[PDB]
Amino acid sequence: MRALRLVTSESVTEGHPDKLADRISDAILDALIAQDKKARVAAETLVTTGLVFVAGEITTEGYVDIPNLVRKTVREVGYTRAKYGFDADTCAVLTAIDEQSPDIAGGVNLSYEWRVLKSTDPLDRVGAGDQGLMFGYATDETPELMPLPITLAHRLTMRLAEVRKTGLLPYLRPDGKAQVTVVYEGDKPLYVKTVVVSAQHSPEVEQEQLREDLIREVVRQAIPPEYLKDGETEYLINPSGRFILGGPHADTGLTGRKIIVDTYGGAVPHGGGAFSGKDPTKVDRSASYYARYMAKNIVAAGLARRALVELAYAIGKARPVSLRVETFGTGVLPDEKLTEIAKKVFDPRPLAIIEELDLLRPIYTPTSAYGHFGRPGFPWEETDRVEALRREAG
């Protein structure tokens, strides 16, 4: 129980090509929802040398100027000069989007329980567009109720971005990676064994001002003091040689290729779905959000120390084929009872999720980097079902 295990998780900055594609997809989604709140979006972004390629499907009654939005989006993460390896003013923007206003195409189609079963229930009205598997997780290791490794990695990359943006370390460029290996004595994290920060930078800086500055201004700020131990914690700063060129020129970036960074950083299983570029009617996003919501409410209410909520949807069906609650020996009550408690407290049907979390708003661009979970100001991070859960449990 006191045994020692090494647990590793990682994050990338907003300037990473994969994350840049995610941000582009979600920026598109946000603009569309800003003009039309029932807009249906599946936007995929490919990012590569000299090029942004946006493809996918859109159903809306608004119009967004996509190329300008894309260039705007590329500018926000910092690719504004050619020397950085990518430049919003001079790169090509390619569009292959099937855009339909809902008069053409159709409205969202009828669920199985409406069409084959003949249900009059209005919350049954929207079925899952696709087959899906979703996992939500919460644990009291951290104040945000998140696993610590992904939390620390996210803080590292987030801070790495902010020291660049505020001008404190102006030699920094957008691309970046951070990795954290934490020592766990059973379920309790003790300290960080290894921190790795890879930061894109101008050749003006040399490795030792780079290392000292990143350790002092990024690592020690981003990682709580208790977990950093001098002489035992190993700090690796750009261990791969120098990192002058980064972003799209170096590598091809795609929407939905950072789904573990997006979620729990390898602490728990994942269902395979990607978040960005998808409107809330895609259960891949909304049901995962709802799963995080359920798990976080369950843990915050004191019914568990660790909770994993699994949702699964059959295509065309509003109601989940499976709902499960897992407490790895941490539950106040048996897991099955916790499961039924959850079934009565929560409503995992798509329309119900959308209404309960108020998902039809342009709120998704900030999720595009640094994780969808563990951050304040998101609907699925509000623990407002605590007392309902506590009363149902007793």
How far apart (Å, rounded) are the C-alpha atoms in residues 104 and 60? Answer: 10
Among the listed residues 49, 100, 94, the one whose alpha carbon sits nearest the alpha carbon of residue 71:
94
Residue 387 in marked binding region: no
Decide whether 218 or 363 has the Cβ nearer to a copy of itself.
218
Residue 53 in marked binding region: no
Instruction: With beta carbons less than 8 A apart as the criterion, state whether 33 and 372 touch.
Output: no
Residue 105 in marked binding region: no
Among the listed residues 193, 194, 200, the one whose alpha carbon sits nearest the alpha carbon of residue 177:
200
Torsion of CA 200, 202, 203, 205, to 10 degrees: -90
Decide whether 22 or 300 has the Cβ nearer to a copy of itself.
22
CB of 127 to a copy of itself, least distance (A): 7
Decide whether 46 or 210 has the Cβ nearer to a copy of itself.
46
Residue 72 in marked binding region: no
CB of 366 to a copy of itself, least distance (A): 20
Instruction: With beta carbons less than 8 A apart as the criterion, state whether 305 and 139 touch.
Output: yes
CB of 255 to a copy of itself, least distance (A): 7
CB of 278 to a copy of itself, least distance (A): 11
Q: Is 239 exposed, middle or buried (0-12, 13-18, 19+ CB in 10 A)?
A: exposed
Residue 230 in marked binding region: no
Q: Per residue in 256-273, is it b (16+ CB within 10 Å) or e — as a string?
A: bbbbbbbbbbbbbebbeb
CB of 369 to a copy of itself, least distance (A): 14
Residue 57 in marked binding region: yes
Decide whether 254 or 357 has the Cβ nearer to a copy of itself.
254
Crossing angle between the packed helical segments 283-300 and 386-393, to the nearest 10 degrees: 60
Residue 173 in marked binding region: no
CB of 363 to a copy of itself, least distance (A): 23
Enter the tokens of residue 30: 């946000």
Q: How far is CA 271 from the centre of its chain?
A: 14
Decide whether 125 or 193 has the Cβ nearer to a copy of itself.
193
In 3-state terms, what secondary structure has residue 58? Answer: strand
In the sheet with 322-326, reading across from the earlier edge strand, the strands are: 132-139, 306-313, 322-326
Decide whether 43 or 352 has the Cβ nearer to a copy of itself.
43
Residue 275 in marked binding region: no
Residue 187 in marked binding region: no
CB of 208 to a copy of itself, least distance (A): 12
Angle at 11 between CA 9 and CA 16, to 5 degrees: 150
Q: Is 17 exposed, middle or buried (0-12, 13-18, 19+ CB in 10 A)?
A: buried
Decide whether 151 or 179 has the Cβ nearer to a copy of itself.
179
Give the number of other CB atoms < 10 A from CB of residue 27.
26
Decide whether 169 or 259 has the Cβ nearer to a copy of itself.
259
CB of 285 to a copy of itself, least distance (A): 14
Residue 258 in marked binding region: yes
Binding-site positions for K(+) = 44
Q: Please enumerate, by residue number, every residue annotated as part of a binding site for ATP.
A: 16, 175-177, 242-243, 251, 257-258, 274, 278
Residue numbering of the annotated binding site for L-methionine: 57, 100, 251, 282
Q: Which residues line the annotated binding site?
A: 16, 18, 44, 57, 100, 175-177, 242-243, 251, 257-258, 274, 278, 282
Binding site for Mg(2+): which residues?
A: 18
